[PDB]
C-alpha cells in the first residue's frame, strides 16, 4: 500500500509493528544519541488495564498512539497532545474458552493500520485470540467489520499481528500445538471479503503455487511435495501455522513470511520432510501464489517453528548490489536469501553451540544433520541446541544500513526431549513430547549480537541474564534499544555494544521499543508486562519444570525479579 509506505518514511509515525515494509526497525532520529542517552528520563505512562504478556508495541500515526492488550485484546487510542485522555476504546467480548487453547500465554502481537482511501476511512486492524479479524475506524474506534478466520473449537487461535498490503489485510494462524493445519488469509479492507487463502501443507491447489514455483531453485522442490512428503492424510493436522511477521517489496509485489512447525512435535508420528512447514515463502500480493518456497528445517524434530521476522536489505553479494531478506530462525541459523529468486546467499549459526546441524550446504540448501542430536521415540535426547524456544524467537530485530549490521536479541537455551504417542482429538493439545530446558554451554540465557548477515561476521556479542525475547530498535544516534525479561529497558552503542543506559520498568518486556517525533521532540516507548513463553511459569503459577512445554524449568528464577504488569512507558530528554 503506497500511502502506507509513504507514511512509514515519516519519523513522526510508527505505522506498523515492523515500522516499515522492510522491517528495518531503524530510525533516522538523532536527538537521542549514544552521548546523551544517559539523560533519557520517563516522560509519561499509561496502564493497559490487563496482566499477562504484552508483545508487539504501540503504533503512532498522525499524532495518535494506539495501544493493545493480551486477552481480551482491548484497544485504546491516545491523542499525543492530551496524553492523559483516551480518545476512544474498543473492548471485545470473547469466549473465555479461547484462553484454554493458547499454548504459551494469551499474548497478542498487535495492531496494524491503513490510511484513508477508496475503501475508505483510516482503519485499525485487530486480530483477536478467538480467531476474528476486526477493522475499526482509526479516529473514532467504531467497529466497521468483523469476520471469522480461526475456530477455537479446533484449537485454532490468532496471536500474530495483521499486515496491510495494498487493499488487503493479511491474517496468519496459530495452534500447531493443537494440530492446526496452518493457513494465511488476505481479506479485502473495505468489505472483509476473503480474497485468498494459502495453506502450509496438502494439495498444490491448497498451497497456492505460481506455475513457476521455485523456477530459480528447483532443487528446493516444486510440485506435489505438500502430499508426497507426508504418509497418507497426516498433513491435514500438519502444523505450519504463521503467527510471526511479514515483509513486503512493493517493487516486486511480493510478501514474505515463514511457516511454522509440523504437528505433532513427536517426529516418529509423521515420517517425511513434512513440506511446506518450516518454509520461507515469497508470495505474490494480489493472488497469494508462491514464487519461491525454501524449507529450512525438513522433518522438524525440535519445534524450530519457522515464523520469525523477515528483515529486508540491499547489500553487495560477490561485488553485486542485491535485494535480500535476512531471517534469524528458531533453529539458530541466520538465513539470507535473494528476495527475488529465493537463492540462498548464506546460512550461518547465530551461535557456534548450535548442534542439531553441522552446517547448511549452500549449493544444495540442505542442513546436514548430526544424528547425535536427533529426536525420536524411545529416546530422551540430551544436550540439544537450540531448544524449542530457539536461539531466536518472536522479536522483530533491527538493521542499520550505514553499518550493514543487524542487531538481535538472542536466546541461549538448550534442551532434553523425549516424544510419546498420543491421539489427535480436535480441540485438544497435540504435542507429544516432554522437555527440559536450561542454559546453553556459555552459562547465561540471553545475548545481544551485531552481525553482518551476508558474511556471517560478528561485530560484537554481549551476555544477558535472561533470553532477550522482545526484539530491538536501532537508530542513527548509534544506539540499539531493547527490553529484558527481568524488566529493564536498555541502550547499547551500536559500534561496540557498550551499555549506555538502563531503566527499571515495572515488569518484564516481551515486545519491542518504538520511537517517533511529536511536536519536534523524539520519544521512545515500550510495553512493560511480562509473560509469553518465558513467563508461563510465573503467569500460571507452574512448578513442574517440564510444564509450559519445557520453559518452566529454564525460567524459574524469572519470578525472583518480575511480576506480571501492564503498562506503556514513554521516555524523552
Amino acid at each position: 500500500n503506497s500511502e502506507l509506505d509513504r507514511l512509514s518514511k515519516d519519523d513522526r509515525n510508527w505505522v506498523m509493528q515492523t515500522k516499515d515494509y522492510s522491517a528495518t526497525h531503524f530510525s533516522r532520529l538523532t536527538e537521542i544519541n549514544s552521548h546523551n542517552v544517559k539523560n533519557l528520563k520517563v516522560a509519561w505512562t499509561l496502564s493497559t488495564g490487563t496482566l499477562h504478556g504484552h508483545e508487539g508495541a504501540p503504533l503512532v500515526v498522525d499524532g495518535i498512539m494506539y495501544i493493545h492488550t493480551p486477552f481480551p485484546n482491548n484497544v485504546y487510542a491516545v491523542d499525543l497532545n492530551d496524553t492523559r485522555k483516551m480518545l476512544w476504546q474498543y473492548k471485545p467480548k470473547q469466549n473465555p474458552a479461547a484462553r484454554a487453547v493458547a499454548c504459551c500465554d494469551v499474548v497478542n502481537r498487535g495492531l496494524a493500520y491503513v490510511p484513508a482511501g477508496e475503501h475508505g476511512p483510516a482503519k485499525i486492524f485487530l486480530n483477536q485470540l478467538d480467531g476474528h479479524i476486526v477493522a475499526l475506524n482509526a479516529k473514532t474506534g467504531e467497529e466497521i467489520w468483523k469476520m471469522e478466520n480461526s475456530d477455537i473449537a479446533m484449537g485454532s487461535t490468532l496471536t500474530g499481528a495483521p499486515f496491510v498490503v495494498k487493499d488487503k489485510v493479511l491474517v496468519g494462524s496459530a495452534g500447531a500445538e493443537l494440530g492446526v493445519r496452518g493457513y494465511v488469509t488476505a481479506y479485502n479492507i473495505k468489505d472483509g471479503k476473503q480474497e485468498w487463502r494459502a495453506y502450509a501443507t496438502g494439495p498444490d491447489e491448497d498451497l497456492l503455487l505460481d506455475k513457476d514455483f521455485n523456477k530459480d531453485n528447483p532443487h528446493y522442490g516444486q510440485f506435489g511435495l505438500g502430499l508426497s512428503t507426508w504418509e497418507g492424510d497426516a498433513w491435514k493436522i500438519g502444523g505450519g501455522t504463521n503467527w510471526g511477521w511479514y515483509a513486503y517489496d512493493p517493487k516486486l509485489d511480493m510478501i514474505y513470511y515463514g511457516s511454522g512447525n509440523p504437528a505433532p512435535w513427536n517426529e516418529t508420528m509423521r515420517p517425511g520432510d513434512n513440506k511446506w512447514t518450516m518454509t520461507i515463502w515469497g508470495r505474490d500480493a494480489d493472488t497469494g501464489r508462491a514464487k519461491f518456497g525454501y524449507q529450512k528445517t525438513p522433518h522438524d524434530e525440535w519445534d524450530y517453528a519457522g515464523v520469525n521476522y523477515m528483515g529486508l536489505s540491499e547489500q553487495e553479494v560477490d561485488g553485486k548490489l542485491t535485494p535480500l531478506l535476512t531471517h534469524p530462525d528458531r533453529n539458530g541459523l541466520v538465513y539470507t536469501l535473494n528476495r527475488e529468486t529465493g537463492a540462498l546467499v548464506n546460512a550461518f549459526k547465530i551461535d557456534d553451540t548450535v548442534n542439531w546441524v553441522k552446517k547448511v550446504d549452500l549449493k544444495t540448501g540442505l542442513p546436514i544433520r548430526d544424528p547425535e542430536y536427533s529426536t525420536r521415540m524411545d529416546h530422551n535426547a540430551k544436550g540439544i541446541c537450540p531448544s524449542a524456544m530457539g536461539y531466536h524467537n518472536q522479536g522483530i530485530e533491527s538493521y542499520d544500513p550505514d553499518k550493514k549490521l543487524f542487531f538481535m536479541g538472542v536466546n541461549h537455551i538448550c534442551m532434553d526431549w523425549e516424544p510419546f504417542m498420543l491421539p489427535y482429538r480436535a480441540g485438544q493439545f497435540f504435542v507429544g513430547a516432554t522437555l527440559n530446558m536450561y542454559p546453553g554451554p556459555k552459562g547465561m540465557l540471553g545475548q545481544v549480537k551485531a552481525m553482518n548477515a551476508v558474511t556471517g561476521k560478528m561485530e560484537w556479542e554481549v551476555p544477558e541474564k535472561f533470553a532477550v525475547w522482545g526484539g530491538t530498535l536501532a537508530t542513527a544516534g548509534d544506539l540499539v534499544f531493547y527490553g529484558t525479561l527481568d524488566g529493564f529497558i536498555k541502550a547499547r552503542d551500536t559500534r561496540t555494544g557498550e551499555l549506555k543506559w538502563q531503566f527499571q520498568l515495572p515488569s518484564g518486556v516481551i515486545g519491542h521499543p518504538i520511537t517517533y517525533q511529536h511536536n519536534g521532540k523524539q520519544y521512545i516507548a515500550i510495553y512493560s508486562g511480562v509473560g509469553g513463553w518465558p513467563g508461563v511459569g510465573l503467569v500460571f503459577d507452574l512448578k513442574d519444570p517440564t510444564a509450559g512445554l519445557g520453559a518452566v524449568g529454564a525460567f524459574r528464577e524469572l519470578a525472583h525479579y518480575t511480576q506480571m504488569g501492564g503498562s506503556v512507558f514513554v521516555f524523552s530528554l
Binding site: 468483523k146 528447483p218 516444486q222 515420517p271
Partner: protein
C-alpha cells in the same frame, strides 16, 4: 539420516537406523480417526460461509451485521 540423500528434489527424508520406513502397521502407527482429521476443514468451510453471508448483507444494505441469525 543426515538429510543430504534425496529420493527426489525437495524430498530427502530417510528413516533412522532401527525405525520403520512407513509408520502404518508399525508400533509407531498414528492410528488417526479419519473423521477427527476432517473436522478442521469443515469448521473452515462453515466459517467461510457465515463470512460470505456477512459480506452479502453489507452489499445489500450498506450496514454491517455480524450475527447471521439477525440477517
Amino acid at each position: 539420516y543426515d538429510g543430504t540423500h534425496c529420493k527426489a528434489p525437495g524430498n530427502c527424508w530417510e528413516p533412522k537406523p532401527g525405525y520403520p520406513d512407513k509408520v502404518a502397521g508399525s508400533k509407531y502407527d498414528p492410528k488417526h480417526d479419519p473423521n477427527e482429521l476432517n473436522k478442521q476443514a469443515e469448521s473452515i468451510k462453515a466459517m467461510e460461509a457465515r463470512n460470505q453471508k456477512r459480506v452479502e448483507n453489507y452489499a445489500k444494505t450498506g450496514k454491517f451485521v455480524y450475527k447471521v441469525e439477525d440477517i
